[PDB]
Structures are given as C-alpha cells and as structure tokens.
Structure 1
Amino acid sequence: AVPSVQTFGKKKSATAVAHVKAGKGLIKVNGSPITLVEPEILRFKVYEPLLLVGLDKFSNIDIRVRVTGGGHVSQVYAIRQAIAKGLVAYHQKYVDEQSKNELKKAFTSYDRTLLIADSRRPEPKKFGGKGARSRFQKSYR
C-alpha cells in the first residue's frame, strides 16, 4: 500500500484532518491548492512550515487537508498545525529520527504551537454578566 499517515490540527473549535502520503508534492485544501487559502494575510502563516523547513522535504510528499468547525483564522491555524504534524509524523514513521529530530528542532526554533495544540480554551460564561467575567452595571441609587 502507499506509505501514508493521517494527522490533525486543532485550534479553538476548528479541526482539520490531513492525509499525508508519498507522491509528487501536491497540497490541496478542500480540493483547492494551498495558494488559495483566505485570508491572504494568513496565507503566508499557512506557508510558514514549508517556508521554514525547505520544500525539498515536500518534493515527493502528497498532502491533502480538509477543515471543519471554528472560524476562518482558527481554520487557518488548524491547517498549519495539521501539515506541520504530518511532516513530523511522516519523517519519524518512514524515514528516520535524525530527520524527525532536525524537523522538530527547526519547527520549534520558530514556533511552539505547530507541534503543540493551543492550550487556551474558551471560559464558560457565568450568570449576571454578558461575558465570563464581566457583570451587569452596578448602580446604587
């Protein structure tokens, strides 16, 4: 069978599933190429893993990611996390740990959140206020 792994990236309520396999180097998001991710301002945030690591490790790797849940920025972050984790997992599983180790060091030198899910989760709202900490305006007279 084709050498492949299945990874995911999460941020807030957004999840993304990335199928990674040996191939020719295509990156399609919901069937659309990576150069089509909106917003364009976070488009380079999406490119950040390949831009940091060099595409020689992307030359013969087929990756396709599908997203669901969350908002646009959350989906963008989920995408970048998913493809970073996919690269690390593939290099560990199919090539070696020297590859996985340099990959991990290069990734962490620029960001910790690519391999690590965002620990901050939304705080539940409490009664008496619109938000989770705010309260209704206090009037005495």
Structure 2
Amino acid sequence: AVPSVQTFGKKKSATAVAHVKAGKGLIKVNGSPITLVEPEILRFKVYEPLLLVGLDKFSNIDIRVRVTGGGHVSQVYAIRQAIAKGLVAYHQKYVDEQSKNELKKAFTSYDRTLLIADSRRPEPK
C-alpha cells in the first residue's frame, strides 16, 4: 500500500480534506500548488502551519487538500486547520510520538485553533 492519513478542517461553512501520504514533498490545494491559494493577503495565514514548524517536515511528505463551501476567508481557515491536523496526525502514525508532541506544542502555543474547531456556538444570555 502507501502510508496515508486523512484529516478534516472546518470553518463557518467550509470544509477541507487533507490526504498526507509519504512522498517527496509537494503541497497542493485543489490541484494547484499552495503558493497560489487565492486571496493573497491571507496567503500567510495558510503558510503559517509550514513556517511554524520548518519546511523539512514537509520535505518528506505529499500533502494534498480539497476545500469547498464558504467564502474566501472561510476556505483559508479550513485549509490551514486541515494541514496542521494532517501533519501532526501523520507524525503520530508513521514516525515517533515524541515528534508528535513537539509539533503539537508548536501549533498550540502559537494558535490553538490550528487544531481545534473554533465553534462560536450561540449563547442565550
């Protein structure tokens, strides 16, 4: 087979499925390289799960995402949640648990909503 791991990300009404399989180090999003995720201001919102943990961890796996639903900003937040959950879940599966821990400490200390859903469930006051 292939070593392969699927994760999911989610903001207001977007969704984003990441398949991470071990390969040579490419990152694509809806069939285009990540360096053209579109709104162009928030490209660094998408790049921050890469540049918080250094590029090499992505030099050795092939992350490939698909989103749908929502608008511009929502699809940005779904992509980066899916990528971050993808990288830490693959690391727990097919490398060591220690590096799972170091990854998740990095992403959580910077921004916990790389990993947990930011659900603004209502409140009756």
TM-score clears 0.5: yes
Change (3 A) 1:31 1:123: farther
Change (3 A) 1:2 1:113: same
Change (3 A) 1:122 1:31: farther
Gaps of 5+ in 2: none
1:77-120 per-residue CA deviation (whole Å, 9 max, x = no partner) reads 00000000000100001111101000000111110100101121
Q: CA RMSD in A?
A: 3.0
TM-score relative to the length of structure 2 = 0.95
Greater Cα radius of gyration, structure 1 or 2 = 1
CA distance in 1, matches of 2:110, 2:47: 13
TM-score relative to the length of structure 1 = 0.84
CA distance in 2, matches of 1:72, 1:123: 26
Change (3 A) 1:68 1:8: same
Change (3 A) 1:37 1:56: same
Change (3 A) 1:12 1:57: same
Change (3 A) 1:12 1:122: farther
* Greater helix proportion: 2
Change (3 A) 1:11 1:95: same
Gaps of 5+ in 1: 125-140
Q: Which 4+ stretches in 1 moved above 3 angstroms?
A: 121-124
Show the counterpart of 2:38: 38
Greater alpha carbon shift after TM alignment, 33-42 vs 113-122: 113-122
CA distance in 1, matches of 2:106, 2:43: 20
